Structure formats: C-alpha cells, structure tokens
Amino acid sequence: MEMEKEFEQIDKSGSWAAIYQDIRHEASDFPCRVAKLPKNKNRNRYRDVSPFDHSRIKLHQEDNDYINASLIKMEEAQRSYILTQGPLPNTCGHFWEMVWEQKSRGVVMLNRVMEKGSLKCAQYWPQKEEKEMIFEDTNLKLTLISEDIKSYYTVRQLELENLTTQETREILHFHYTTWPDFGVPESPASFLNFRFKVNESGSLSPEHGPVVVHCSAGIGRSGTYCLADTCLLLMDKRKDPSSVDIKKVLLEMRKFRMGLIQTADQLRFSYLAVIEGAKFIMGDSSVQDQWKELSHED
C-alpha cells in the first residue's frame, strides 16, 4: 500500500511532528464571526474552538440560532457528519434540538464527562431509565430505554420526543469510554471494533440525517474518528486502498471545521487504523472477529 509505505518512511525519519505541522499550516482559515458574537460567549466551551460561519449548523430558533457545531460534508465519499463540542450545562437543550432538527439517529461520543479532574462535557443524557430528562427551553424529552455496557464502550438506546408534536424517535448513543483526551485508542482493533458497531447500527444510512460526532471540543478525537471513517469508506467504494490520500482527506475535512486531529500521534493512529481496516474491505472478514477478541469487550 502506498499509504503503508509512506507510513514506514515517516516512522523511520521521525517526521510525524513535521508532517502534522505541515497540515496545520496548509489548513483552511475561514471566519467565525457568529461564534464570536458577545451573546454567544457562554455557548462556546473553548475560546479557540469555533465553527466556521459557512458550515455551522443553525438551530431553527428565531431567538438565537447558534450552536458550536459544524456540518462536515465529504462530497466524494458521499457522507456527512456533524461535529460539535461536548454540550455545556446551558446548551444541552440546543444539542438535542440540533439532533431533532437535523434528523440524526446516532450520536458518537468519544470522551467522558470527567477527564483528568475536569468537566469536559455536560451530563446531557439520562443515566437511569426512571429519571428522564426534560429540556424546557427547547421542549424536548429524553429517556434512557436500555444500554449495553462493554469493557471500553457503551451503546445506549434513547428515546427523544418533541413535546410540541408528541413525535418520538429512537436515538442510538455510541460512547467510547477509554479514549483519553489528546490521546489515541488502545489499538486499531479497539477503534475498528467500535467503528463497526456504529456503522452496523444503520445510524449512517442516508435516509437519516448526519451522525453527530463529538468529544470535548469536537475536533481532536472527533477528527481522528472521522478521518479514519471517511478514508475507509472511500477505499471501500473504490476497492482500491492505494487511491486514498489520507492527508488530502484531512485537509478537505478541515475546510468545514478547524483543528480536526489535535496531535501528531492522533494523525499516526489514523494511518494505522486505515491500514488495518483495509484488510476487511479487501475481503478478509475474519479480521472482524480478530478485532473483537483483541479489543477485550468483556
């Protein structure tokens, strides 16, 4: 693979920092003036992480339509994502309003609520079936229906109801719980096993809205997951691993949201995950059971 030969070169020359810095220097720079308006200051988790104006998700509210969230539209791969920060205590209603209005059926969460003693994300979903959450500002109700706890990730079945219309939808919550902030997953196997659970759920089928992916800021771990997912989808559509330029795909994604992938090692993990995932795409299905065993779900 042209991609695994390049990987060997970068490793042998120790160029991951240099390669990653090159991507930071070439990355798009678009205005974020809605995100920077004074009235939106308390809707942003990080002052240095904002959505571009041209690709931000607008809430269908006449009052204030701003949420820190971006629509990544990968034209060639024919897949879209919504990347967003971990909701704040005052934006959990906005978050589920976005999920409703964009018709998403899956939420991919790559962080924990508390990491390194800090609250990196609000508790925006219910932890107990009998303690549903009501978001008064956006008139939404959220109920935990069931959850499937594995050793390093949890899948939750949620019911989201629009209280104005009494319409309900099932939302699937894919929660990767062992991915450290500014770090990498334990192995390509762990990551690819989790990715398969997401893809196999149907959450990314095109009759639904785009899947929501978030970490704490919605750029680092979110960017790593989304880069690997898009690259694998591309080589799956083509059945040609050598036709995929990972760095070019990352630069394309960064046209829609800043800072996707936050460390050089996350970039390196992206290569490893795509290289390993190519095995399943090119016709070795047994590697999926290998990944499940290697991930130690139990």
Residues at the binding site for substrate are: 181, 215-221, 262
Contact criterion met (CB below 8 Å) for 197 and 94: no
**DSSP codes of every residue in 128-183:** STTS-EEETTTTEEEEEEEEEE-SSEEEEEEEEEETTTTEEEEEEEEEE-S--TTS
Nearer to ligand OTA, 217 or 273 (CB): 217
| Closest among 175, 286, 297, 275 to 228, alpha carbons compared | 275
Nearest approach in angstroms of CB 175 to ligand OTA is 13
Of 194 and 280, the one with the shorter C-beta distance to ligand OTA is 194
Applying CB under 6 A, does 181 fall inside the site for ligand OTA? yes
Which does residue 215 bind out of Cl ion, ligand OTA, none, counting CB within 5 to 8 angstroms by kind? ligand OTA
Q: Which of residues 38-67 bind ligand OTA (CB under 6 A)?
A: 46, 48-49
Per-residue mark of binding to ligand OTA, 196-235 (x: CB under 6 A): -------------------xxx-xxx--------------
Q: Can you tell me which residue has the tokens 């609520």? A: 113
Centroid of chain to Cα 129: 25
Give the distance from CA 173 to its chain's centroid.
12
How many degrees, rounded to 5, is the angle at CA 27 between CA 213 and CA 257?
25
- With contacts defined by CB under 6 A, how many residues of the chain interact with ligand OTA? 13
User: Which of 107/217 has CB closer to ligand OTA?
Assistant: 217
254 binds ligand OTA (CB under 6 A): no
Question: Quick one: which segment of 9-17, 34-42, 118-126, 156-164 binds Cl ion (CB under 5 A)?
Answer: 118-126
Can you say which residues are annotated as belonging to the binding site? 181, 215-221, 262
The DSSP code for 210 is P
| Contact with ligand OTA (CB under 6 A) among 70, 102, 104, 111 | 111
The amino acid occupying position 157 is Q
Residue 34 or 119: which CB sits closer to Cl ion?
A: 119
Q: How far apart are CA 232 and CA 236, in angstroms?
A: 6
Interface with Cl ion (CB under 5 A), residue from 1, 119, 155, 294 = 119
Amino acid at 119: L
Comparison of 57 and 215: residue with beta carbon closer to ligand OTA? 215
Q: Residue from 1, 122, 155, 275 that binds Cl ion (CB under 5 A)?
A: 122
Tokens of 203: 């959450």
What residues are annotated to the active site? Answer: 215
Under the binding rule (CB under 6 A), the answer on residue 136 touching ligand OTA is no
Work out whether 70 is an interface residue with ligand OTA (CB under 6 A). no
Helices marked H in the chain: 2-13, 16-26, 92-101, 188-200, 220-238, 246-253, 264-281, 286-295
Residues 269, 224: contact at Cβ < 8 Å? yes
Segment near Cl ion (CB under 5 A), from 28-36, 103-111, 119-127, 277-285? 119-127
Angle at CA of residue 125, ends 169 and 35, nearest 5°: 95
- Using CB under 6 A as the criterion, which residues of the chain lie in contact with ligand OTA when the complex forms? 46, 48-49, 111, 120, 181, 215-217, 219-221, 262
- Using CB under 5 A as the criterion, which residues of the chain lie in contact with Cl ion when the complex forms? 119, 122
